Amino acid sequence: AVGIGAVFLGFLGAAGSTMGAASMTLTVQARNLLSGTVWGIKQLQARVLAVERYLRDQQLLGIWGCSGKLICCTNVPWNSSWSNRNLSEIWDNMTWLQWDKEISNYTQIIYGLLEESQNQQEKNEQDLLALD
Amino acid sequence: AVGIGAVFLGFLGAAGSTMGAASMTLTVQARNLLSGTVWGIKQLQARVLAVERYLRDQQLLGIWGCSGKLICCTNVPWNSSWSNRNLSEIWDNMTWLQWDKEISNYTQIIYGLLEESQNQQEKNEQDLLALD
Amino acid sequence: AVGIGAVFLGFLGAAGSTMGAASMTLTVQARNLLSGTVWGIKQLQARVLAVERYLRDQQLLGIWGCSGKLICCTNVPWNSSWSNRNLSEIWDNMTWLQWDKEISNYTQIIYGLLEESQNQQEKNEQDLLALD
Amino acid sequence: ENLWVTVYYGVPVWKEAKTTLFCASDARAYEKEVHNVWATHACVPTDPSPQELVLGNVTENFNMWKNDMVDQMHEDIISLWDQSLKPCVKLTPLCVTLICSDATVKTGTVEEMKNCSFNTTTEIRDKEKKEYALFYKPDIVPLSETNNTSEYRLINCNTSACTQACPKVTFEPIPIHYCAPAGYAILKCNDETFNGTGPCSNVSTVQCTHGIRPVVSTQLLLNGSLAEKEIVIRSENLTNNAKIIIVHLHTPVEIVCTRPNNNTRKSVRIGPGQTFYATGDIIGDIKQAHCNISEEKWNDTLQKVGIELQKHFPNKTIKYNQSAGGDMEITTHSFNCGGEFFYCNTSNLFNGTYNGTYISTNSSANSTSTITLQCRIKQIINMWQGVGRCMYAPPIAGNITCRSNITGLLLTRDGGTNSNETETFRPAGGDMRDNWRSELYKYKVVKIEPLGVAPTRCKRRV
Amino acid sequence: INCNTSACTQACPKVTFEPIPIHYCAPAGYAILKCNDETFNGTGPCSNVST
Amino acid sequence: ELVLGNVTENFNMWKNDMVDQMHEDIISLWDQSLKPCVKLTPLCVTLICSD
Ligand SMILES: *[C@@H]1O[C@H](CO)[C@@H](O[C@@H]2O[C@H](CO)[C@@H](O[C@@H]3O[C@H](CO[C@H]4O[C@H](CO)[C@@H](O)[C@H](O)[C@@H]4O)[C@@H](O)[C@H](O)[C@@H]3O)[C@H](O)[C@H]2NC(C)=O)[C@H](O)[C@H]1NC(C)=O
Ligand SMILES: *[C@@H]1O[C@H](CO)[C@@H](O)[C@H](O)[C@H]1NC(C)=O
């Protein structure tokens, strides 16, 4: 109304559209987050920090795979302790805002698991290169 | 004479060799564009801005695919309004400098089209992951 | 003991474990190298330079392929002048520290060769896109 | 098969770095008043943990006298100090003819307390007030070209304008646990014996150095670390008479200093804004600045040093002597206890020699016998030879006392062609670089160099 | 009055002192939200929210 | 344009630290703009006057 420009050039507009909506739009959100006497320091710090944040996130995305698709399968199963909701409930009713309030726990658990499944794949690929 | 070092360590040397020439050389051009009291601000600003420009371009390349190959097919057809020249004329006679004087129009049209064809591919891939 | 955190959150711990050890661990090393009145300049310079170094290395990795796997085959054969050791000696007995003392010669030779084999692949791919 | 090349990103190797470190302040010296704390206000607080490594089978070459890091440290101290004193206390108006008379005379150290009068600027520029204060070291200089008259000048009127101090600022060493920037790492030697250079085999990683409290001192060094196992004698070149020997002692020695006299303070407003501080009075008794050190411990130390020193200077007697001579800034021990600046004559701390038997014989006793050194206190000093950065001390109201857990030693060597049966060791010092070098040496800074190459023979299908 | 206090200045005579609105903007990575709600006590769960 | 739809959020005026940024800058901007001029120290002399 609004549309993608306001929602993602601007931010967080889709938070009220439930997470299934995201599948058609999470593109622009990323590109518009990378924009660009004593005040010179204030401005330089801001610019540098924005860059650092961006790059650090890219580093994790790289490490875990896949990663240029923005939506990736990492071939790690879910722990049953995290399966207290139906998938339809998650995708059709819940928002990212809402999901994120509870799923926020075990952050590093997920990261650990992601790093390791990727490491295993990599070894298998190296063996295949060596075998072939 | 010259050679790649002068042409692309240095810049724009191939502009006079017509665009078909580019297919064998557009490599170095990219790497040498990423090099590195009050003057400290002047220097910091320059460094930061060079980085920002680089990263912003990388962001678009990522979004549109493919993108690490530097030359990519995006599976978007040409609008006939843009087909006023023969392909041989474009590749053998014209320069990038020259092409760019006219093809400069409709910049955002192309970007819009590129973003969307990529979005469509991504949905199909997600469905294939789900189906498989 | 130690473990990955101390070895690679901290640095160079695996240098004493010989290079074959590296195949299971060179992950964390990379992510922890990208962390973040007049002293404001000192700090800004440090931050910027760390970023520049990172990005420049990424640029070469991109150019040569493959490159997101951190370990890549580039399909370039070895020159016999560089084959004065057995592969088992290299992987099981030598360290990266040690290898690097001698293999340090001919740095640009390798880079030249890597760039070119990648260029050749790219042309063949463009012809295949055109043929198909 | 045929061998094929692969590239390895992120390999654990390194090269010598030439970079800078930073605060890393201790996050404990921080309170609201930190803005009044020298070299803390300016710094960023951190709280990093120690490193586990242990680099296994890795060994590396260290060299204390080539570690450029010390210069970074030196340069910053000079510049931090100076910057912290800019917005206050310009003393230019003070340089007027001073009129004065004798204390009591008698003791040379009391005679100096001159009753000094002058005529100066009041709140209204048009008027002058006759006023007075006590001064005593010859920072007060007989006026040039007078003839034994009551007229004096300030010492820095044929030099450059001086400042006093921003009165609010605290000068107390806070350890800075210097940390590396991303891309850099710090290595340290955990080895004993270590000459100051060579292939350390017990090597550990460092994220941040152990913090070190800066101290300005000469000759005997205070508030430093102790050797873990044995006295270490270190020198760039033992045979080079121009070099200074650095000694790390194993056990602590305690030093007690004081300025016993009940002192008062007064201040004078000079023109607008800024007030000047000076000693008001000293209510009746007579002072002697001094430092009491146990002799017992002292003798034990000198012979233990002599025993170790004997290794490089075998079959010879070790003799100690006094400094070469010069201004107190050159020859005396220097302390900043309480913020006051002391000059302490070494006489007769190094009045001895030991027969090359160095017999470690002593006994239990109820004796508390000490060696007492006497001191002198100045008001205007050239901070680190910063004549152009000269400053006048604020007075402090009190019976000032000072402890310290001591000491590091700075020594030199002498003796001509007429000896070589014995060698003479004298007190040495004056270079701030060595004061830090002494502890900084433990660390080396290196750069992580990712991305290496190796053959594998494996090939990519494509 | 200020001789028993500190030195004062007058003004650079050329300078204009007139309030100019500053439409403060966020750095990249940040966004600003606002309440479009009436009633609002100064705190609480605004329901009419705009970027 | 947003309008965050179905999103609601908690606001609190007396906790918004932003005001301090604003306060601090005004103090510092004001002061800096007046440095290169009009020192009045010479003025502080005995003044003579009448009704
Ligand atoms: C630093 O070293 C200083 C130099 O020694 C210390 O000064 C000593 O401090 C003690 C405590 O003030 C003084 O003690 C006085 O001792 C006399 C005793 O001496 C008289 O009687 C003995 C009997 O053996 C006789 O041997 C002496 O000749 C005297 O006849 C007492 O009478 C006093 O009332 C008081 O206890 C020492 O005199 C003093 N030595 C001096 C003044 O040089 C100083 O304390 C050490 N530490 C400090 C704080 O400076
Ligand atoms: C210094 O001289 C003045 C003149 O009033 C006198 O009042 C003051 O007592 C003297 N101070 C000392 C230390 O005698």
Q: What is the DSSP string of D216-263?
A: ---SSEES----SSS-EEE-S-TT-TTS-EEEEEEEEEEEEEEE-S-E
Q: Count other C-beta atoms under 10 Å from residue D67's C-beta.
A: 16
Q: Is the peptide bond before D407 cis (omega within 30 degrees of 0)?
A: yes
Q: How far is C32 from chain A (nearest CA, A)?
A: 10
Q: How far is D455 from chain A (nearest CA, A)?
A: 12
F 9-28 residues with CB < 8 A to D: none
Q: D444 exposed, middle or buried (CB, 10 Å; 0-12, 13-18, 19+)?
A: buried
Contacts of A130 in chain D (CB under 8 A): 456-458
What experiment produced this structure? Answer: cryo-EM
Separation CA C13–CA D52 (nearest Å):
9
| C23: nearest CA partner in chain A | A123
- Interface check D3 vs C, CB under 8 A: yes
Separation CA A52–CA A45 (nearest Å):
10
Q: Where are the domains of chain C?
A: 1-132
**Token pair belonging to A87:** 């998938």
Question: What radius of gyration do chain D's Cα atoms show?
Answer: 27
Type of residue found at C102: E
Nearest ligand to the CA atom of D292: 1
- D53 within 8 A of D204, measured Cβ to Cβ: yes
What residues does ligand 1 touch, defined as CB less than 6 Å away?
D 292, 370, 372
D123-to-D29, D146, D241, D273, E2 alpha-carbon distances in Å: 38, 32, 59, 9, 9
Residue nearest (by alpha carbon) to ligand 2 atom 13: D115
Q: Do A36 and B52 touch (CB under 8 A)?
A: yes
Separation CA D332–CA D349 (nearest Å):
12
**Token pair belonging to F50:** 């009448």
Type of residue found at F3: V
Q: Which of A126, A130, A132 sits opposite D461 (nearest CB)?
A: A132
Q: Which of A106, A111, A103, A120 is nearest to A64 (CA)?
A: A111
Q: How far is A31 from chain E (nearest CA, A)?
A: 10
Q: Which long-range contacts (CB under 8 A, 24 or more apart) does C77-81 make?
A: C77/D2, C77/D3, C77/D4, C77/D5, C78/D2, C78/D3, C78/D4, C78/D5, C78/D455, C79/C109
| Atom of ligand 2 minimally distant from the CA of D134 | 13
- D97 within 8 A of D130, measured Cβ to Cβ: no
Determine which helix (DSSP H) or strand (DSSP E) holds C40, and give its type and residue range: helix C39-64
Separation CA D11–CA C104 (nearest Å):
14
Separation CA D14–CA D444 (nearest Å):
12
Q: Which of E28, E31, E51 sits opposite A50 (nearest CB)?
A: E28
Q: In A37-89, which residue ranges form alpha helices assigned H by DSSP?
A: 39-64, 87-88
Tokens 């997101």 label which residue?
C68
Q: What does the DSSP assignment read for D347-408? A: TTTT-EEE-TT--------S---EEEEEEEE-SEEEETTEEEEEEEPPP--S-EEE--EEEE
Nearest ligand to the CA atom of D99: 2
Q: Which residues have CB under 8 Å from D330's CB, separation 6+?
A: D323, D324, D430
Separation CA D427–CA D322 (nearest Å):
7
Final resolution, Å? 4.3
Residue nearest (by alpha carbon) to ligand 2 atom 8: D115
Q: Which of D372, D276, D359 is nearest to D310 (CA)?
A: D359
- Going from the Cα of D156 to the center of ligand 2, the distance in angstroms, rounded, reads 25
- Interface check F27 vs A, CB under 8 A: no
State residue D442 phi and psi, 5-degree precision. -65, -25
Quick one: how far is CA D86 from the chain centroid? Answer: 23
Output the CA torsion D225→D227→D228→D234 (10° steps).
Answer: 140
- Going from the Cα of D134 to the center of ligand 2, the distance in angstroms, rounded, reads 9
- Interface check A34 vs B, CB under 8 A: yes
Q: Which residues have CB under 8 Å from B21's CB, separation 6+?
A: B14
Separation CA D335–CA C109 (nearest Å):
60
Residue nearest (by alpha carbon) to ligand 1 atom 1: D292
What region, left, alpha or beta, does residue F24 occupy, with left being phi > 0 and alpha being psi -120 to 50 degrees?
alpha
Separation CA D132–CA D116 (nearest Å):
5
Cα–Cα–Cα angle for D133, D138, D144, rounded to 5 degrees = 100
- D84 within 8 A of D38, measured Cβ to Cβ: yes
Q: Which residues have CB under 8 Å from A26's CB, separation 6+?
A: A8, A70
Q: Which of D178, D239, D180 is nearest to D214 (CA)?
A: D178
CA within 13 Å, CB half, D100: 25
Give the end-to-end CA distance of chain A in Å, rounded to a whole number.
55
Q: Which of D227, D224, D223 is nearest to D250 (CA)?
A: D227
- Interface check D452 vs C, CB under 8 A: yes
- D100 within 8 A of D140, measured Cβ to Cβ: yes
Q: Which of F1, F5, F6 sits opposite A10 (nearest CB)?
A: F1
Separation CA D303–CA D363 (nearest Å):
15
Q: What does the DSSP assignment read for D263-325? A: EEEEEEE-SSS-EEEEEEEE-S----EEEEEEHHHHHHHHHHHHHHHTTTSTT-EEEE-----
The strand pairing partners of D192, in sequence order, are: none
The strand pairing partners of D258, in sequence order, are: D290, D401
**Token pair belonging to A8:** 């993602």
C 66-85 residues with CB < 8 A to A: 68-71, 73
Pairing of β D221-222 and β D342-344: unpaired
- D137 within 8 A of D395, measured Cβ to Cβ: no
Type of residue found at D385: Q
Nearest ligand to the CA atom of D371: 1
